[PDB]
Predict the structure.
Amino acid sequence: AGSRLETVGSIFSRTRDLVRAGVLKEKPLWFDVYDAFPPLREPVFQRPRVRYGKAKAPIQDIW
Amino acid sequence: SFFTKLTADELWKGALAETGAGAKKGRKKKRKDLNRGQIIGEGRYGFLWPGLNVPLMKNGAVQTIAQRSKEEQEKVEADMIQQREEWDRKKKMKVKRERGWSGNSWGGISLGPPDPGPCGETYEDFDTRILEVRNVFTMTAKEGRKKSIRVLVAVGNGKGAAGFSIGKATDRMDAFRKAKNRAVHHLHYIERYEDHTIFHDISLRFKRTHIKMKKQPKGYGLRCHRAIITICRLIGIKDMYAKVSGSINMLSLTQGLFRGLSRQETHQQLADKKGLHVVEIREECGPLPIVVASPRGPLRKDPEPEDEVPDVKLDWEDVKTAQGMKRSVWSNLKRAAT
Amino acid sequence: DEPWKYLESEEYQERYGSRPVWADYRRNHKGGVPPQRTRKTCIRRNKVVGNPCPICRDHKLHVDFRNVKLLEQFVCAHTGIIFYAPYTGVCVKQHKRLTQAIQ
Amino acid sequence: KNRAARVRVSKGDKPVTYEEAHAPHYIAHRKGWLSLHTGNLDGEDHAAERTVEDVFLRKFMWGTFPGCLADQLVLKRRGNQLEICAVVLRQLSPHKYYFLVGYSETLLSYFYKCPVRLHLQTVPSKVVYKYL
Amino acid sequence: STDFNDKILNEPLKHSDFFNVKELFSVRSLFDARVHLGHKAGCRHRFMEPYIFGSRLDHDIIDLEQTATHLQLALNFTAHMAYRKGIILFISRNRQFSYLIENMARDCGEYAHTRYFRGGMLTNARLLFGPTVRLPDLIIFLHTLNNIFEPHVAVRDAAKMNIPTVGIVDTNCNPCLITYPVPGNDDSPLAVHLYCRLFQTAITRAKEKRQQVEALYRLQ
RNA sequence: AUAUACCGCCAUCUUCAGCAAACCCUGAUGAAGGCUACAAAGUAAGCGCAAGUACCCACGUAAAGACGUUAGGUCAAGGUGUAGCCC
Ligand SMILES: [Mg+2]
Ligand SMILES: [Mg+2]
Ligand SMILES: [Zn+2]
């Protein structure tokens, strides 16, 4: 079946790679929709890090 | 007497002593079936019963009770003894296994394809290889020192899709089954350049294990750590160099190898990222420029910076080898085909 | 008389397949690093030693300069260099015969 | 612990029939007696003779049909008639089954001086009630 | 069947907005439903910074301009999945809205799971339900956080099982593993009701359009 | 001769409720860990308890009572491994 490594790439990347490698016999129902209308950001896992130095959140105040 | 007789199974259970004080905690004989070579209607008197041990009809006529001659019965006994001896020899001999990295090691030993999936899924294209078999003990009050087996298993279809898993079990075969059935659900897809090698050199440090992989041309072979050789065979990589430094922990080595291989950047991705043709220069092909990658989107007309000096963190071993100062008596040793 | 006929034969295909004749050979040696030289010869005084090399273990394989299909298995297709003896496991005698036949 | 006529669960892999899966304290409750004769009733005699005959019949049919009996025999006595009902596998050829039926019936009838009959019910394999 | 499979399945993928979901909502409607309201600046999660318009008196405000595009993409994806007769599973551990969400699912012919999420409903579904069970083809989170403010385990499980997930992410949520995140308020009753109505309308429109297309092809 | 080779039949905690395969998840896929009901990763077939059954009820008494523990008892119920005796 599909790879369960949620922290490696996205679901689309893993599914496409497995289909190309022939592990997945048939593409899932959602694959064509994702290919046609991908989201703005690929859902790649990312570990959040807290800022430590001069870097600060760019969220400007509303005035 | 007769009523004191028992069944074969009960007698074997009593004689083999599979359970008891000695076998309870480990504070040689084996079962042999006596019915495999015995035919109904055969006795020491050598009688021929029509319909049970001999054909009911001979020459289209009903057979009668017949008794084999003494010489014929001797021949039958000799045939029975010969069959028993041949079966005993066949059972004693075995098809010798293919040893792994060493005769008594479990690494490199193939386990066959993983068990088929329930929903019509088969993994006959996948090969399973053992990488480490450790006996792990724990201190429990109830049982003293509890023993278990942890097995590291790598699987792969030889076409990029490969994975690894860890199986904990009280029984070694159960650990193998668990690990090899869990690995196929954790399959990385490793991109291979020209379906034989990695796309570029990979320098990684997973925990305390440094892995340095060098892309190599066709026919260079796998000059890598034996575990990396096995994993690359599972992936489908045929030419690569790999040096392991620091801790050589097998689990960390496998995890770092898979991390680096999965995180490698393909030529097409580089071309799309920087919007420039990725052109290959080969010494054997002379000055011919081979455009191995081209950007999907619009091409970048920026002639790119002609960096006079590249600020790249070199490795001292590579520079020493290139300059010839390295004189290790173990490098470039002739070895069997990998 | 016709060594290439063996490689054209069905028995060779069944025994070896598309793999080279040395694919399944594995030297038995001490340690993890094999000795840098193979055995001098697998046939000593017309007697065959244990674990003979791929050439010696199959009497129908003749190292003859006309047996080009067999000699191709001992030359790297990508670089054209003849594999050294430890690479394929052939003994020194058969390796010298292979080199002379290839030349 | 009670070790009498019980199958101990080890890995949930051992197949057991309905008879083996039930401990003795279930005889009156879930598995009737494998033999049915009036000897053990009140005021009836020859219980020991019937018991000895039943034991001999079981040990004789077990060896006459080696590896064929799927489960334990069922012995019924009606007057002087004796009926052995046996669940048998389909491994052996029907010719051998009929030969054994005739041989066993005649030999038992002449040995015990009673009209013995043998009814065989064939099953493809040993019926598994549960796994232990 | 190719003349059927192609014409019904592939044709809607040729249109930028086949189901015309962009008419179902507007930035004014989201503003009225208090979609733009977020948590305190202290509770802000790092990955939600790009979707935050700004902070108004230490209160984060969600950029409805990005919310419009994200919601358009999510509604289009949900409508396409429903049109393909996929299984849609709404998930929200917010008790206050639980009942309502369930009703919406029961009204849209889809499935809901608002109660406690037992360990392994997705990664062990072959054993919990059966070897032939069909996992959902799309999961919609009305709330991406459990009752202890950690991300819902269903997000990670669906990412493991390669199930695309639409999700309403507040300022303190983690949109990293969500396939189609919609930055919006998940606490106001108006916002949750608007999301439920929008997804219900998208799914119903998709199902009725699928019925219309199938009937039209049969009449061809 | 050996219960310190066993089957067989049992003692004992047991006047116990735990034993658990098979999966899933967490720890970077380290020896490990998996508890929250206004619930936060566990599910569990099966075994035992329970249930059901016997006796006079639904109560009670029996029966039942797993995995383990004492190298627990029995080679003298019987069978059997090993070893020994055969004027
Ligand atoms: Mg050895
Ligand atoms: Mg919120
Ligand atoms: Zn030789």
